[PDB]
Design a protein around this ligand. Structure first.
Ligand code: AMP
Ligand code: AMP
Ligand code: AMP
Ligand code: AMP
Ligand code: F6P
Ligand code: F6P
Ligand code: F6P
Ligand code: F6P
Ligand code: ZN
Ligand code: ZN
Ligand code: ZN
Ligand code: ZN
Ligand code: ZN
Ligand code: ZN
Ligand code: ZN
Ligand code: ZN
Ligand code: ZN
Ligand code: ZN
Ligand code: ZN
Ligand code: ZN
Lengths: 328, 328, 328, 328
């Protein structure tokens, strides 16, 4: 019975804000609804396929990537609440014109789960919001803040149903989109991740390339030393989907470094940080295996980072393995 | 520009049918649309959670399972085209009253992907249609036909978009649901699976319980003897989603036997057979590792069977491993 | 619980049809849903405004007129059930190519209520279906049959809700469109108009031009000789809306001849005949004031005719006035 | 490209408001969307019919009336921006609990056009917002302010498309609901009514009861003294629909007093005032024929008032007739 629109406004009136943060969130909600509608009928609109370009990270751009990116950018520019935007689909940070400038910096992944688009598997949108720290003219440097500085982070999941998960200092909340009235409804308040799960999520196709710690951990999940039942495996292939399941079911999600991705594949600014923030606000952990994801100070808007996140006891067990091998 | 309604009718007029098959298909389409709408807003309608009962196979029944099951059953009974119905949610076969009896037997899985319902991961509906073979009164025995006898089989996938995949003697076709007008639109005609893929799909959590063949194959996917790049791994956890990806991307999907499921987990009548039929009509293969899934003559409407399906070259490679170990 | 798709098919299986009539009806339903979706968001799609052309009758063509006309024509041509099409938006009858020819002739008004489009008042689509009578090549002459020869007639009403009213030899039935699942649901079966109503519908702006009979009748509705309460007046301005209200509430609808429209304004083939058929099948009457609308043999596909329709007692009272003045 | 959500917020940030007005408007938008969705499928949900009660004005309450009333009331109470609510469906004013109290007073007509519900003709929702004037505890007296004191007024029209018309000191704006994304989009900015129209809207069924002025005016519309073409007549029967057409097409709408309704039928607080405000902000006029509607100080929350509104030249002509007869 509580809509996201009311939630965000009521939360804004309590925080006594000028109103641009609230409007920033309202804009994202609108963009998310537009993206969801397009996604639920993409094939019919001939939105499946490549766009004909390659982004900095090296991924092949898809048509839905372009549409989603365009929607987010346009809605954020007219929110009059942003000054710098960093997108997975743009080589450089986008500087909003003075006229439409706000004090918020937004890092986003317009469409996450590229490889799953054509097979209709869950995909989504990820975002992280920062407050401008510098006093000088807005630049790409303003998006180079550690995740711990986020004011808000979350993601839209276009799965069997569309969910918008929003995390802020107060905690994590889940809102489901009701397609009939175009409103996100609060369905899970102050979400807390289970202390320990029974599912591990990772692409084992890179087994020959995993470091000794990941290798040992996976072996432990399949052949438990305490003779307990093995963990079940799940790997949707879309970070947003695997992470959301990790949040509501508990367990662990991993994307460590490998031969082709020496520093991990996932991007720090718009993939790792937003999810690390959601995880920590839900009582979970997010580490590269050597340091907290949210403490990393980025030097490249598109830098990558290995990431392990989920239930605290599971992530801690893996961390202990990394520590053990480091003292070896 | 071609709707499923037109497709099915035009296909029926060419086959010169009395019209009950066409109506049977029309009924399924309506049920699928109703299920999709409910699925896209399940959380809001409080449809997440257990129903309070356990089916024959031993699974814990969910609320969406009940809703979907009720929809399919009711729509099939009023289609005046069925005489015997076998559902994953019903202990025994359902015998349609004489008044509403038709000559078709339908085996279905109202909602596949139970464990993925609550985390919003893709789920779906699977069905297989047989023509009554006996001459005596319709009974559970009429659903105990080998998959090779299917007249039609397919599934609805409630993923980022809703897709209805239908297979018949003429081939496999994919129709996407356009939520705005409530019509499934043909988006992929006469689908053919790739001869060889680059993705393997299986729950490796059961590694300690896999037979030597599966174990050897997975090792080969991670450490290719020809030194080629390893296969990527994907396991959504919902048979319908993993199978659909296998169909459009190619590769292999596996659910072999393990300690808890000595004869595999997936059910022959409404999970394995429908997908095996779709796969073979698309030029793919479906085997237990020892025999063709579609050739198995069932003796229990709820019997399980191990299943390996997908691209012919991939499935064949695994089969060769099974043959090698059998002659060992 | 009964969908139009099931209704039409079940009705087709009982009539033992080749299937093209059923498919013809299925095609119209699809076109109606597409038109309804466009109508509910026309302003946003910039569909309000003129197209830049004038039809034979002299009306200024609108953009929605073009869209609706295009949808109906395209869906009817691919139904493989029509041979001649007459549209209010086309100067001449449309002859379907031999390849896609069927034996049905369809006269339709793609979008009725032109003057009400921009103010968001109810509009709709009207249609009448005939069976080809001639043996020679299909031509415009095949649409020149009296309304009494109709096999099916009806209209889609895009009002507060979208309704599809279908009339055939068996009677009149009303189906409401459920936007969520894109299915028309039977809500009013075997509709019968009240014997006498309490509402008269006519544009009194043409008062100076009305014939003595209409003038006397209206005076009687405002100043009842039996001292009963006067009839209420209602004139939406869209024939489909005024006629539908007349059907479900009873009463009378009138569009007599006037100075600018000596033979009435409404068109016989796709406005008057379809509604006259619906009215008579519902137990109502439809007259020009001098003869039954359905008995008129047209000589022009776009000829006009005065029309009075609705509850039998009300229409009869007006007819008696016409008879009285004719014997004067 | 401009959503109502953005419009209202951007308008609120410019007016430097605490945020409850913005939230009040956001709440109404949500209620309007919920009502629209229900309306577009009312028949299917069995929402047509009487509720079993009669309101103070004497109207027979319908089911949709109850649903709409419940939605508006509940959404307004949780907006934390209202203190007194006056509904056409409630005998007395509703006093919001201290906990959820705001400083705004809202008078509304949850569902206008009762007699048109069952025939699917356009219906809507009307509202007027006042700022609490008193300093003492909120009571019914706080809603007894003249229309000139309104801070905001408007209506939702559930016609061929759903439109939300909002009027405030800055002017009148029209937003169309896009059912796909559940957002109202600005389609008509700073609307201004034509100085003179060519349509008169009134129920002429009450002709025997009209005062001499109305009678003379109508005669003038049918038999123009300047020999110009007569005005066309339109009377949908739902105030919201007739008024909206008057706004966008120009012309005049009239509901004068008659035998059964000596002081007019329409209610001052939630029918006449909101529309009079919209009209005047659009450059139109609204009079009882003897005084400006917005200047009337109400003494009963459900009092009625005769109303004449629309294009200034048309309303003025009628006013001159009233003046002429008063000096007679
Ligand atoms: N809707 C909201 N929900 C939560 N926190 C908010 C909201 N609006 C403002 N805030 C907080 O107040 C600060 C200032 O808001 P603003 O003046 O809109 O930039 C933000 O950076 C947030 O920390
Ligand atoms: N719509 C259809 N699409 C494909 N095959 C059909 C269709 N309708 C009928 N058939 C074929 O014709 C047979 C007889 O149809 P029926 O008389 O409806 O039971 C079916 O068992 C199918 O093999
Ligand atoms: N779905 C249907 N509903 C009602 N009457 C039908 C239907 N299908 C066929 N008919 C009747 O049967 C005749 C022949 O149908 P067809 O062979 O499809 O042209 C039609 O002209 C109708 O009179
Ligand atoms: N969203 C808005 N649009 C227009 N005027 C507004 C808005 N919000 C506030 N106002 C104006 O500012 C006043 C105070 O707003 P509030 O503090 O929210 O009660 C209102 O009574 C309006 O006159
Ligand atoms: O195919 P891989 O290497 O497992 O990559 C999967 C990852 O790729 C991404 O699409 C990013 O490119 C993530 O959403 C997902 O976690
Ligand atoms: O958790 P597991 O053992 O991998 O089971 C997954 C399988 O379970 C099912 O939900 C059937 O119960 C399938 O849809 C899916 O393939
Ligand atoms: O404005 P008038 O002359 O009353 O015409 C109204 C008629 O015009 C039409 O739009 C046909 O042109 C009908 O739908 C409607 O009954
Ligand atoms: O049937 P009548 O007397 O013309 O009343 C119509 C009026 O009734 C109302 O429904 C109010 O009861 C208005 O919406 C409309 O203007
Ligand atoms: Zn990418
Ligand atoms: Zn991504
Ligand atoms: Zn991306
Ligand atoms: Zn199950
Ligand atoms: Zn299943
Ligand atoms: Zn199931
Ligand atoms: Zn026209
Ligand atoms: Zn027309
Ligand atoms: Zn027309
Ligand atoms: Zn009322
Ligand atoms: Zn009203
Ligand atoms: Zn009302």
């Amino acid at each position: 019975d509580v809509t996201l629109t009311r939630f965000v406004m009521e939360e804004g009136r309590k925080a006594r804000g000028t109103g641009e943060m609230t409007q920033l969130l309202n804009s994202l909600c609108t963009a998310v609804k537009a993206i969801s509608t397009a996604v639920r009928k993409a094939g019919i609109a001939h939105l499946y396929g490549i766009a004909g370009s390659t982004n900095v990270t090296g991924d092949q751009v898809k048509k839905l990537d372009v549409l989603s990116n365009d929607l987010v950018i346009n809605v954020l520019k007219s929110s009059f609440a942003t000054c710098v935007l960093v997108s997975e689909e743009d080589k450089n940070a986008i500087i909003v014109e003075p006229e439409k400038r706000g004090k918020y910096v937004v890092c986003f992944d317009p469409l996450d789960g590229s490889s799953n688009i054509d097979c209709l598997v869950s995909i989504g949108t990820i975002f992280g919001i920062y407050r401008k720290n510098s006093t000088d003219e807005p630049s790409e440097k303003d998006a180079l803040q550690p995740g711990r500085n986020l004011v808000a982070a979350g993601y839209a999941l276009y799965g069997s149903a569309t969910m918008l998960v929003l995390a802020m200092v107060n905690g994590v909340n889940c809102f489901m989109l009701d397609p009939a009235i175009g409103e996100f409804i609060l369905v899970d308040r102050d979400v807390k991740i289970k202390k320990k799960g029974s599912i591990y999520s990772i692409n084992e196709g890179y087994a020959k390339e995993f470091d000794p710690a990941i290798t040992e951990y996976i072996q432990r999940k399949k052949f438990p030393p305490d003779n307990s039942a093995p963990y079940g495996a799940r790997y949707v292939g879309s970070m947003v989907a695997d992470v959301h399941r990790t949040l509501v079911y508990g367990g662990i999600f991993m994307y460590p470094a490998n031969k082709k991705s020496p520093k991990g594949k996932l991007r720090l600014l718009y993939e790792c940080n937003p999810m690390a923030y959601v995880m920590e606000k839900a009582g979970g952990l997010a580490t590269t295996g050597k340091e907290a994801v949210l403490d990393i100070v980025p030097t490249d808007i598109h830098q990558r980072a290995p990431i392990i996140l989920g239930s605290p006891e599971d992530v801690t067990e893996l961390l202990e393995i990394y520590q053990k091998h480091a003292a070896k």
